[PDB]
Amino acid sequence: REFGNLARIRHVISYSLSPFEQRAFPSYFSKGIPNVLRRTRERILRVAPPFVVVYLIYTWGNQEFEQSKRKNPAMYE
Amino acid sequence: IEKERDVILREMQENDASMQNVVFDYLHATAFQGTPLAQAVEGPSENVRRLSRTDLTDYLNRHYKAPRMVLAAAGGVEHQQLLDLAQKHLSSVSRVYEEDAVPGLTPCRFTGSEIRHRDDALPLAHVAIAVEGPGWANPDNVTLQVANAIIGHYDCTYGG
């Protein structure tokens, strides 16, 4: 619970650099756009199609409501 | 060479088992990374195993030059006798270079960084924190040594 002991770690070596000696935006675009595009490829098929169904039945509900608003010519005499 | 190579492998294992030397080597590496000052004195085990006699002869003929040698004597010794003996023995050291392959001192950058070798099975933790020093020729060495005396040192067996 306390920061001194939480888990048992053996033979693990961590390397770290100084924030004032390394850049804050290292390859923000060249290595940034492929990363976000890869994430989009990984998690685009599980998210988008439900919202496509939302948009489809949204338009369908609006169309049916407007058609119920519209009358019919079943009243000729 | 083979026998002492086995000796160096065993001594590297022993020094790996020594807590303070590992931390000082880690500090040197993480402070002077990318420079010839990061590498330890004993060197990596791969270079120890792959090093040959011709590399030793190259090091002897490149770095054991005359003007970078100081013959120092202290005690019941006469400087005239020492100079005569040095003229007798250490006259021919071949200060000249093999094909004018003269090396040169290059500055080594200091960097702010850390290395953390976590191994929780060990009983105690050794931590070294340092900054860039002044160098040998800088007159701030006396002041920084005085400041180190202000901070002091302690061992658990101190009677203070």
Swiss-Prot record, chain A:
* Keyword tags: Acetylation, Electron transport, Membrane, Mitochondrion, Mitochondrion inner membrane, Phosphoprotein, Respiratory chain, Transmembrane, Transmembrane helix, Transport
Q: Which Pfam families match?
A: UcrQ
Keyword Cell inner membrane set for record = no
Q: Which residues lie on this side of the membrane: Mitochondrial matrix?
A: 1-41
Q: Which residues carry this modification: Phosphoserine?
A: 14
Q: Which chain regions cross the lipid bilayer?
A: 42-60
- Residues annotated as carrying N6-acetyllysine in the record are 31
GO BP terms? cellular respiration; cerebellar Purkinje cell layer development; hippocampus development; hypothalamus development; midbrain development; mitochondrial electron transport, ubiquinol to cytochrome c; pons development; pyramidal neuron development
Record's bilayer topology term:
Single-pass membrane protein
Q: Which residues lie on this side of the membrane: Mitochondrial intermembrane?
A: 61-77
* Keyword Phosphoprotein part of the UniProt annotation: yes
Q: Which residues carry this modification: N6-succinyllysine?
A: 31
Q: Where in the cell is it found?
A: Mitochondrion inner membrane
Q: Output the InterPro entries linked to this UniProt entry.
A: Cyt_bc1_su8, Cyt_bc1_su8_sf
One Gene Ontology cellular component annotation held by this UniProt entry: mitochondrion
The similarity comment for this entry is: Belongs to the UQCRQ/QCR8 family.
What is the documented function of this protein?
A: Component of the ubiquinol-cytochrome c oxidoreductase, a multisubunit transmembrane complex that is part of the mitochondrial electron transport chain which drives oxidative phosphorylation.
Subunit annotation: Component of the ubiquinol-cytochrome c oxidoreductase (cytochrome b-c1 complex, complex III, CIII), a multisubunit enzyme composed of 11 subunits. The complex is composed of 3 respiratory subunits cytochrome b, cytochrome c1 and Rieske protein UQCRFS1, 2 core protein subunits UQCRC1/QCR1 and UQCRC2/QCR2, and 6 low-molecular weight protein subunits UQCRH/QCR6, UQCRB/QCR7, UQCRQ/QCR8, UQCR10/QCR9, UQCR11/QCR10 and subunit 9, the cleavage product of Rieske protein UQCRFS1.
Q: What's the name of the protein?
A: Cytochrome b-c1 complex subunit 8
Q: In which organism is this protein found?
A: Mus musculus
From Swiss-Prot, chain B:
List the source organism. Answer: Mus musculus
Give the sites modified to Phosphoserine.
52
Tell me the compartments it is located in: Mitochondrion inner membrane
Q: Which residues of the full protein are shown?
A: 161 to 320 of 480
Q: Which residues carry this modification: Phosphothreonine?
A: 54
Assembly and partners are described as: Component of the ubiquinol-cytochrome c oxidoreductase (cytochrome b-c1 complex, complex III, CIII), a multisubunit enzyme composed of 11 subunits. The complex is composed of 3 respiratory subunits cytochrome b, cytochrome c1 and Rieske protein UQCRFS1, 2 core protein subunits UQCRC1/QCR1 and UQCRC2/QCR2, and 6 low-molecular weight protein subunits UQCRH/QCR6, UQCRB/QCR7, UQCRQ/QCR8, UQCR10/QCR9, UQCR11/QCR10 and subunit 9, the cleavage product of Rieske protein UQCRFS1.
Tissue distribution is: Expressed in neurons and astrocytes of the cerebral cortex and hippocampus (at protein level).
* Domain of life of the native organism: Eukaryota
Gene name of the record: Uqcrc1
Which positions bear N6-acetyllysine? 3, 88
Query: How does a null allele present?
Result: Results in early embryonic lethality.
Q: What is this protein called?
A: Cytochrome b-c1 complex subunit 1, mitochondrial
**Protein family according to the UniProt entry:** Belongs to the peptidase M16 family. UQCRC1/QCR1 subfamily.
Q: What does this protein do?
A: Component of the ubiquinol-cytochrome c oxidoreductase, a multisubunit transmembrane complex that is part of the mitochondrial electron transport chain which drives oxidative phosphorylation.
